[PDB]
Design an enzyme around this catalytic site. Structure first.
Site: not given
Lengths: 389, 535, 553, 553
Positions: D101, D154, D172, D244-245, D267-268, D409
């Site tokens: 991850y 992203r 994930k 996601e992303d 999730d983001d 992050n």
């Protein structure tokens, strides 16, 4: 090479995959140990029933069919469910069953082929496959084909043009190459070339299985036949036997004259007939074929073609020569003997045909074995069930 | 902890596709499907519709001289192209039922070893003790919904046929699919082989079972307990176990024991009771009168005999609002010894059926003896003398074992009898077939679609009332108390909806909440045998 | 009568096709192939050529810090996309040989259990007694042409690695395919597991073999006999059985016994002999002189030492027409006890006895060099640094151009390095080694020492036997292979100091060797693929497996 | 009417079984399993337990020099023996999360084409327009429960990685399995390839996607609509679609649209708000106080800043029974232009407007800290070292126990480090970060700062939805998950300075989150698995996939 290939996957056959493969299926003859090892336990009733008991049971049921066509249908279904049982049953009951699996019931089967169509048998190459014949051959799951029996269905026995429904004849003929001559059935390939039919009854029949158009002739026909013969050589090599059958006479002679110079070819209606009638002695396909062989030197063709085919295969012959027909005739005459000892007769014919191929420099399985009769017998397919790991 | 079978999955193509009866369409594969699945050349050029394939098969089938040959061709079709088999069966149900089910299926069991063809179902024998779960693991369908199980001890009225009894559960499940729309991949026919007491079969070189006498007592019980535990472990709480063709004492014991722990149904006991009750409700709608006003006399006091009698007494108590013990007083049974315990009322001991007919004076006579020609001219004339329109059910199967024929019932009563039979009969008056196939497919579907965990007697009453509701003036005029099998899919949808509604009402259903229209829901769940289009 | 395995065949599609290394092309499947075999969506949209996949793999491989990590990535590739593996190996042979073969393959065998990944080859153990044929039936390729078998008792100079010896035959067969064009589906690597005497492996929790000491005598013999009978029963008379990595007494006994009944060769004895003789013929073409005029001295008198000495004496007997016994007279060997001499004869292993000439005993190689004054010094001892500065300087004092072969493997076991051979002889040694050494800069010159790698010979020798349908190996085929390799060594490689041609043209070299071996099989009446084709070089090339991707229907 | 795929089933044996990652046990196949499934001889004699295979794998993995090499070895294991992969991952979760991850999974996406190995997931591209359902039919698992989908626009803080974004949904889903017990056969990673605006990738010969700029507007919308309709048609109403992303605006639009028609989670957006709320509830349990009593200050007012602020205000509204507008009043955010205030309203993006309270304008975080005097400071700025010594000291002057979350992050972007937070507050800060920091030795104590890893929440949330048969995600399920995670934080972890419990007990944590989410689905009338079981924790545990090897028949 550049040509596309089919990716084949191989795995151990077990469960219903094994039960539904006619090459491996033994039915109730699978032993308790085979059932445990191949995940058949429970899929079958407890009894283990020998090949001999299965033959007895099948023959008892077959004799209860009122119509010969129903016996033929039960025989085709058996061939396509347990091949070894089918061949052992056929060999042991050849006199009784030849009229059902072959002439005359096979002719009625071609007339009714569409209406009785059951388990798929053989390969069909039609006008719709022009430019794609090699691609059609790649769908056939046996790579090492030794004997092809091909028809365009134009002259089926004395029944005329049966078009695409002519497939019953090469299917029937190859069963005889296996049962009578010991040619491996996995190396046999029945083919029907569908170029249409001039049979108006079939063209009007809702159950007809072929292209619903009149018969192509001339250049359109020639181009498909040339592509077919080139595809067979490309894919199966120089040693594949192409046995032409039930073609109209002008076409049969033209095909034989042309392809006998470039491939291993024979026409059973012309050459097989000529050979069997000469063996007996000691104006069409038969009339001129026989006359020619007489000048050069039951009348069932099944006395000659199984042994002749075997002789070509075991010697790796690349051409059929007229002297092989003379050798086949002399070998049969030296033995008409009944069909009960056909396997021994076929071994003698195969040895005489193989010897001639060596003597003419047409054989590729070099050097020749010392005892060609014992060698022919050692090459014959046995339909006794195998034991499985 | 339990071992698992590692299964491999791949796209079916070529001969793998042609040899899989679930996917094989024969000549109905389109040119595009043939190209995509490597069939080009393996089949002749013509593309032949499912409808043309049905026509071709029916033409050939009608040319067989013997019913057993029709049966053999039908089994071979089931095991080569199952969609074609089910579509053909639905469309030609009236013509084909006598070949795929009673009476030909009985003859198929008698000759099962000699006509053995394509493998069907699962066999569990005494040799599988301690390994029943391992045997179930070989079955290639994980989500089993309906199991039809037998030990072959009571095949129709033919007796002990041992391991050869497999023809019955195979036939029954083909009917759950064709008539009730149960998915065939969710059906599992099972034969439990504990040996056979049939000496002819034990001496027969073609017998397919364990060549030993029947195991009884503890040895039998231990295998049955292991089997029922294995079925629950592997298929869960919602799997339907339909017991069939078990001998009477055993059938009642198995039903009493496993109906408390599993979803179980005994067709010979409960399916019979349900179809005959529906027949009686329909007959009362045709000739007049109520169930309470009738006097009942049965010939045979086994599974079918006491099974029907018990449900008659139950429906009578729901209508009259009286205790069941009172509703039993007007129901009488004659066994092999003469005129099981709740029926032994105070009465003089009579030996023959004729003397019971004269003393009891019944309005309804039901034959479940398994003995042929037991309803004589004298008995049928006495029934016609006692009653204006006597109700006569001659249910013993196969045809030779029937108490009397339809021709005999109408001739001896001068066309006044209300006749129903177990065996298929030709018109004389169109005799109704009091066939269990009217009830079990819809009942089975109703349990599956509601996620029922137990069968309750009230579901049998709901199934009986829904079948009787389908019997209209359209069939009464011909003399038939039952609607024809031509509309069996619609009938099964109504039965399934009534059974499912009962499961929800009793708190026995797990598919919660119930859909608003249970008839439309049952229809939406039914398997359709129309060919699929393939990627 | 014997049981058969029922095999089912179907069209490979979807993950069945992606997971079959024989058919998997990865991202090289075209959009049309993806559509026809149900791969659309299982792969990202890009179609990426075999050439781009090779580049990507080589880029990643060069980033591993440890050679063992390169070896692991190579084995994983072989077992995921075999055409990519073989094409990558052929194109990058010089760079990759040290990773897939000696020396890294020796480290792979030492660590085989701890790095165990995708299953390769077939294992036949003592637990398979009475069931060897049953084990062979599990192998999914029916038409096996080349078996490489080991019991793992002698891996390079590393000794006994037991069941972990499987790394060697797996590596050898990848070279029969990549360098010789033998179809990989016709290759079968086998390890015979009879236990191991290696105490470290018996104590290792990751050891993959039977956790017992080596069986010997009758128990061993009965398994080997059952194995050799099973191979003939199942694969016929024409299957090649190539023995490898067996300890010396066993290797000579197996070769003597099975060479009479099967098509066999032992690569450590015969393959080594053939490449070394080719190196000597090449060294003599480079510097002048004849085989007969030389005086030979070996350090190590085992499988390689005596195998090479025998082939030298045999080639010399053909060149001079003198008896082989006369040709053995100027060939000397030093074992762990010193010079092999007549006075020692009673205590010598039989393979040493033809070399035990009359001579005073000598206990060191240095004394043997000073007394015998060889023109050729060959190290097959398995012991590193035994060709000392003093020994190499004495060789350079005795000879203008000393021929020095330091053949012990892996690298730390080499008798001396290339740097040492050229420095200690002032650039006058004609040097070759078993281990790959980098070029040496000495004076103003670059010396590229040749590697006397068995892979120059066995791929072509194997192909030559297969294409001719040979039923027996004859010593004259080894001589034909040696002469064919030496004919490929020219001034082009001699000018750099290399006695061997480079591995860059190995496919052409193997075709010449195969044609010379096949011609010898026909000439000796040992060939069954009759009649012989007229151009054996073109015929060998036409038989070679090409790892270019196929197009799928 | 729709076409169907004809699937054939057979017993897996031999190489078919060895090459199936779902069934392959490698050397853990027992002698009895080997005999029954035709593996005898295909494997060496040793039977090696799952525990020994884990040890062997971990030993080799630790020897790779590059993190990307560890990632590649892990992906190869997932695609060769999935039970081994999942059991290894569970047992070594703390060590392996940075490789499988974040952060290594992002590097894997950047290099995805160059490291492409065994195929994972399903790709749906613009070339599949009108054929999306046909692409789903190629996926060999019929009963999909969880789909993780991206268009790769992203990826972490790495930007647009196009088709190479596939590494994120693959990573994930391995976590939904390992951490949440979702069956891997029910997991489907999908990448939607509409092109990429990444010029470096479009120029890269190893790029695996469509070599075009990213489609936008109608062309994009039509593919997304066809995709979402295909997922419902094929997998039904209960399939979970986890986005996601995606870029911020697209992610917002997709979530608003598909949350009304499908079971949808981003999730983001949603997982992030939930995990940070859980951290805050745990911090308050550690140091005392209620959510309502706090004053919040955020640095960064984007997707994370405003998403977290909204969920804090929502939980506060439930606890106090006050409108959410009242609960937003003590929540303040600083963006790139300064404090978000009422006077700035005309120039603010609409999503910032609920936070624009009346206040004098302030341009620096330092001035905002001094004026607002927050008790809680949260960094979601993406800008490293913005929580300066002066700011952190002022937080420690204003509060006895300042709550400081530095969530940017990776560690290079973190507002401050753990070392800095503890030193600058004399060990009094309650600290958490987005990325892991090593333990801090301050005074005589060891401080283990916890991480706001989304992996704490999404596995159990996804499981809770699946086991309850939920048809919609409701914001109250996010509150239930946060409360369930915080309830798992105890004095055992508080004594070490960690507000989150460790990942070592993640299976237990996920079971509690799953039970709380499932209870919420039943309470809201959104669950279809009726009636609810009485003990939802025991029910969640009973549903969890166990990666212990099966025994084979």
């Amino acid at each position: 090479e550049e040509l596309p290939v089919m990716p084949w996957a191989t795995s151990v056959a077990s469960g219903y995959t094994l039960l539904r493969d006619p090459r491996h299926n033994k039915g109730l003859a699978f032993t308790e140990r085979e059932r445990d090892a191949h995940y058949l336990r429970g899929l079958l009733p407890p009894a283990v029933v020998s090949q001999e008991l299965q033959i007895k049971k099948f023959m008892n049921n077959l004799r209860q069919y009122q119509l010969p066509i129903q016996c033929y249908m039960a025989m085709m279904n058996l061939q396509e469910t347990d091949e070894r049982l089918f061949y052992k049953l056929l060999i042991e009951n050849v006199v009784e069953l030849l009229p059902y699996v072959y002439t005359p019931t096979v002719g009625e089967a071609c007339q009714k082929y569409g209406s009785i169509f059951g388990r798929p048998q053989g390969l069909y190459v039609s006008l719709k496959d022009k430019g794609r014949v090699l691609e059609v051959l790649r769908n056939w799951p046996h790579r090492n084909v030794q004997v092809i029996c091909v028809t365009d269905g134009e002259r089926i026995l004395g029944l005329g043009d049966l078009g695409c429904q002519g497939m019953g004849i090469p299917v029937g003929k190859l069963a005889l190459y296996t049962a009578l001559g010991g040619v491996d059935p996995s190396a046999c390939l029945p083919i029907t070339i569908d170029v249409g039919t001039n049979n108006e009854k079939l063209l009007n029949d809702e159950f007809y299985i072929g292209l619903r158009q009149k018969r192509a002739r001339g250049e359109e026909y020639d181009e498909l036949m040339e592509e077919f013969m080139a595809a067979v050589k490309t894919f199966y090599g120089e040693k594949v036997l192409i046995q032409f059958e039930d073609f109209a006479n002008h076409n049969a002679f033209d095909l034989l004259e042309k392809y006998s110079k470039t491939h291993l070819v024979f026409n059973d209606d012309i050459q097989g007939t000529a050979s069997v009638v000469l063996a007996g002695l000691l104006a069409g396909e038969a009339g001129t074929g026989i006359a020619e062989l007489i000048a050069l030197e039951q009348s069932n063709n099944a006395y000659i073609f199984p042994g002749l085919g075997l002789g070509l295969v075991i010697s790796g012959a690349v051409r059929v020569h007229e002297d092989m027909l003379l050798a086949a005739s002399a070998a049969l005459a030296d033995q008409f003997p009944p069909f009960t000892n056909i396997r021994k007769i076929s071994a003698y014919i195969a040895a005489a045909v193989a010897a001639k191929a060596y003597e003419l420099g047409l054989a590729t399985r070099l050097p020749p074995p010392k005892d060609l009769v014992a060698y022919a017998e050692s090459c014959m397919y046995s339909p006794v069930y195998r034991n499985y790991q």
